[PDB]
Amino acid sequence: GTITSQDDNVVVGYWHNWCDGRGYQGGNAPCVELKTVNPQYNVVNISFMKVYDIAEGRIPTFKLDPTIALSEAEFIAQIDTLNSQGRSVLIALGGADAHIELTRGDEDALAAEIIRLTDLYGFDGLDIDLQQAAITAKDNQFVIPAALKMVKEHYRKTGDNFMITMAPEFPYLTANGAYTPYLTELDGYYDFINPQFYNQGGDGLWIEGVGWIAQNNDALKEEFIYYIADSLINGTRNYHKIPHDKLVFGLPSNIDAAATGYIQDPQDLYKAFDRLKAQGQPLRGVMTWSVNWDMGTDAANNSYNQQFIKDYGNFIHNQLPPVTDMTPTLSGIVDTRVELDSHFDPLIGITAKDYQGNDITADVTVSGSVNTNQVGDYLLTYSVSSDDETTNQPRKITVYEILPAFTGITDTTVVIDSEFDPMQGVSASHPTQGDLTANITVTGEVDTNVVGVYELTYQLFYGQDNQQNMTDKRIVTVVTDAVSDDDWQVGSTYVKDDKVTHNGATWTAQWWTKGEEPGTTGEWGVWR
């Protein structure tokens, strides 16, 4: 077949490239032939493309499991059958426990291998299902998008829409989260995203005014679906925006398919989707891990017997076609701190794209102005318009000033008649004004001829016209080098004629003493 893409709603189902997988509740997922997958799965994702052995190098590939007892030619024939029915068959990249680790420069080879596989098997696109370390490993976040742009562009040349989808686990979809480079680099290139709303336990989101709604909360499942979808399709509540026409809700087929996330009561999904439709934002479909689980058995060897497609196929297909959200995007805008009098350029680092991923950076406009010569906050708003839609985003610029620092102003003791230079070892600096030593004045003097304690007040003047100032005080004590009688000690014993220094005076013992303080023994006592 040819490249077969989906224009309307989708029910996506992963297909296991292996047999008899064990379920989270002890069930079993048989391998199944593609031609047996229920027709209402209009996108079927071959799982998985990955590195099958590092002796083949870093570029991942796909190798059909022969125990499924499809020859290569037969597998190709069943893909062609699905394509003849207008269904798409994508190759899923990654999966659980698949490590992929690419280096900048691997993008040409990855693209070449994607195309090779696509042309050989009849695949219609590729699903990004990077998990754990593979999301962020080495240069993956650059290489994988770059490769896929090439692949898209290669098939566009012949008028074919090579589909690109992704299956991020929903916790990675916060605004600056690990999947964000894939989503932003491929804006305009991807057909839809089918996040996983399973296996995340008690993770979820905080709804200001209703509380924490967890993915494992079966009492609040309607609210979970509604609010996490509402946040995603509007870029609110700290989630990255995925337009509603491009959001497909991923679910486990049953309790064996994933540890948590199974919808016990399909009504909760019907109602959440209906609510989303009611505010003008119908979703694009559902996704499931997996067709094999939908055709599998539980631990008691009872058949699941297609309960997932029974619950969701007709509901999702019997909907109007999607309506494209053509809002443009802005990238690069972050509140920024700028030091007083530095240069600031409000356009550097900021870019914009239309909904098809075309660069429209030159079309951005900015209102507001920053005055880097005055500390304070300044608010800018960036705007861009395309396709009769407009996106805006604020940016706070804070102008701040840093105090200079003195060095060398430490209390010190010097000997009588020594030379003392109050500026010796003293400096000031500032990060932007540089050496400010010449801006320091000294109030007070030290007289090194006269024993005593001398205070010096250092002032630094800085800033515009030197009208800012800071002060620091220093004590310089001048001590004699004159040797004197040893200080009186309260525990020492003295005898007649012994002399001691105490309380600034020299005293002479008149007889035996221990523990009597000089100066306190009166007109006629032991110390005189």
Ligand X SMILES: CC(=O)N[C@@H]1[C@@H](O)[C@H](O[C@@H]2O[C@H](CO)[C@@H](O[C@@H]3O[C@H](CO)[C@@H](O[C@@H]4O[C@H](CO)[C@@H](O[C@@H]5O[C@H](CO)[C@@H](O)[C@H](O)[C@H]5NC(C)=O)[C@H](O)[C@H]4NC(C)=O)[C@H](O)[C@H]3NC(C)=O)[C@H](O)[C@H]2NC(C)=O)[C@@H](CO)O[C@@H]1O
Least distance in angstroms from the C-beta of 1 to Na ion: 4
- Contact partner at residue 259 from Na ion, ligand X, none, CB < 5 to 8 Å by partner kind: ligand X
Question: Residue with the closest Cβ to Na ion?
Answer: 122
- Contact partner at residue 239 from Na ion, ligand X, none, CB < 5 to 8 Å by partner kind: none
Q: Name the residue nearer to ligand X (CB basis): 167 or 380.
A: 167
Least distance in angstroms from the C-beta of 200 to ligand X: 4
Q: How far apart are CA 174 and CA 191, in angstroms?
A: 20
Q: Residue 346, Cβ neighbours under 10 Å: how many? A: 18
- Contact partner at residue 97 from Na ion, ligand X, none, CB < 5 to 8 Å by partner kind: ligand X
Residue 122 near Na ion by CB under 5 A? yes
Task: Choose the binding region for Na ion from 62-70, 119-127, 333-341, 472-480 (rule: CB under 5 A).
Answer: 119-127
Task: Write the DSSP symbol of residue 159.
Answer: T
User: Which H or E run includes 339?
Assistant: strand 336-339
Least distance in angstroms from the C-beta of 116 to ligand X: 22
- Contact partner at residue 225 from ligand X, Na ion, none, CB < 5 to 8 Å by partner kind: none
Q: Residue 474, Cβ neighbours under 10 Å: how many? A: 20
Is 293 known as a binding-site position? yes
Q: How far apart are CA 390 and CA 233, in angstroms?
A: 16
Task: Choose the binding region for Na ion from 2-10, 255-263, 281-289, 299-307 (rule: CB under 5 A).
Answer: 2-10
Contact of 165 with 125, CB cutoff 8 Å: yes
Q: How far apart are CA 262 and CA 312, in angstroms?
A: 13
Task: Write the DSSP symbol of residue 9.
Answer: -
Q: Residue 40, Cβ neighbours under 10 Å: how many? A: 16
H-type alpha helices, 23-106 = 72-84
Least distance in angstroms from the C-beta of 14 to ligand X: 6
Distance from the first to the final alpha carbon of the chain: 120
Residue 423 structure tokens: 């500026």
Binding mask 29-68 for Na ion (x = CB under 5 A): ----------------------------------------
Is 229 known as a binding-site position? no
Q: Name the residue nearer to ligand X (CB basis): 24 or 420.
A: 24
Q: How far apart are CA 83 and CA 123, in angstroms?
A: 9
Q: Is the dihedral of CA 89, 94, 98, 101 positive or negative?
A: positive
Return the bridge partners of 19, or none. Answer: none
Q: Name the residue nearer to ligand X (CB basis): 97 or 435.
A: 97
- Contact partner at residue 215 from Na ion, ligand X, none, CB < 5 to 8 Å by partner kind: none
Least distance in angstroms from the C-beta of 96 to ligand X: 3
- Contact partner at residue 1 from ligand X, Na ion, none, CB < 5 to 8 Å by partner kind: Na ion
- Contact partner at residue 200 from Na ion, ligand X, none, CB < 5 to 8 Å by partner kind: ligand X
Q: Name the residue nearer to ligand X (CB basis): 195 or 322.
A: 195
Least distance in angstroms from the C-beta of 123 to Na ion: 6
Q: Which residues touch 286 (CB under 8 Å, ≥6 apart)?
A: 10, 11, 12, 248, 249, 250, 251, 269, 312, 316
Contact of 224 with 263, CB cutoff 8 Å: no
Contact of 245 with 325, CB cutoff 8 Å: yes
Least distance in angstroms from the C-beta of 133 to ligand X: 10
Is 96 known as a binding-site position? yes
H-type alpha helices, 202-265 = 221-234
Give a three-class secondary structure readout of 173-204: HECCCCCHHHHHHCCCCCCEECCECCCCCCCE
Q: How far apart are CA 145 and CA 151, in angstroms?
A: 10
Q: Name the residue nearer to Na ion (CB basis): 83 or 391.
A: 83
- Contact partner at residue 330 from Na ion, ligand X, none, CB < 5 to 8 Å by partner kind: none
Size of the site for Na ion (CB under 5 A): 5
Q: Name the residue nearer to ligand X (CB basis): 44 or 440.
A: 44
Is 289 known as a binding-site position? yes
The helix/strand/coil state of 522 is coil
Q: Name the residue nearer to ligand X (CB basis): 109 or 259.
A: 259
Least distance in angstroms from the C-beta of 228 to ligand X: 13
The helix/strand/coil state of 315 is helix
What residues line the site for ligand X (CB under 6 A)? 14, 21, 23-24, 29, 48, 95-98, 129, 131, 167, 169, 171, 196, 198-203, 257-259, 289
Among 124, 127, 268, 294, binds Na ion (CB under 5 A): 124
- Contact partner at residue 155 from Na ion, ligand X, none, CB < 5 to 8 Å by partner kind: none
Treating both helix axes as pointing N-terminal to C-terminal, what angle do 107-121 and 140-156 enclose, rounded to 10 degrees? 50
The helix/strand/coil state of 237 is coil
Residue 1 near Na ion by CB under 5 A? yes
Q: How far apart are CA 4 and CA 161, in angstroms?
A: 8
- Contact partner at residue 199 from Na ion, ligand X, none, CB < 5 to 8 Å by partner kind: ligand X
**Which positions lie near Na ion, rule CB under 5 A?**
1, 4, 83, 122, 124
Residue ranges of the annotated binding site for N-acetyl-D-glucosamine are 96, 289, 293
**Annotated binding-site residue numbers:** 96, 214, 217, 289, 293
* Binding site as annotated, residues for Ca(2+): 214, 217
